[PDB]
Design a protein around this ligand. Structure first.
Ligand SMILES: [Cl-]
Ligand code: NA
Length: 96
């Protein structure tokens, strides 16, 4: 997997662009959507009541060891996550 099309480094940190597939057995990175420039993430939650947002952010805060917030897409499948205070190098190392 090449994650460089799904990330950009901003003033505040790194914006990781994902597309969520809900209702999964396990939350996990499964591939790259190159048409969207987004990481495909299976999410073990239903897509109701913010449960997929909660699971998604829990999984990524654990992975990066950084504050993760949804900056765009709270009610979309295509969510942009700001990982505050981190470089793109560090995020790519963690995604790999
Ligand atoms: Cl910027
Ligand atoms: Na949700």
């Amino acid at each position: 997997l090449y994650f460089q099309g799904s990330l950009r480094e901003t003033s505040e940190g790194v914006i990781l662009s994902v597309i969520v597939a809900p209702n999964a057995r396990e939350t996990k990175i499964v591939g790259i959507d190159g048409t969207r420039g987004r990481v495909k993430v299976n999410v073990a939650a239903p897509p109701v009541k913010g449960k997929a947002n909660k699971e998604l952010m829990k999984f990524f805060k654990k992975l990066f060891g950084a504050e993760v917030v949804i900056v765009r897409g709270e009610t979309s499948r295509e969510k942009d996550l700001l990982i505050k205070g981190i470089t793109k190098k560090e995020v790519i190392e963690k995604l790999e």
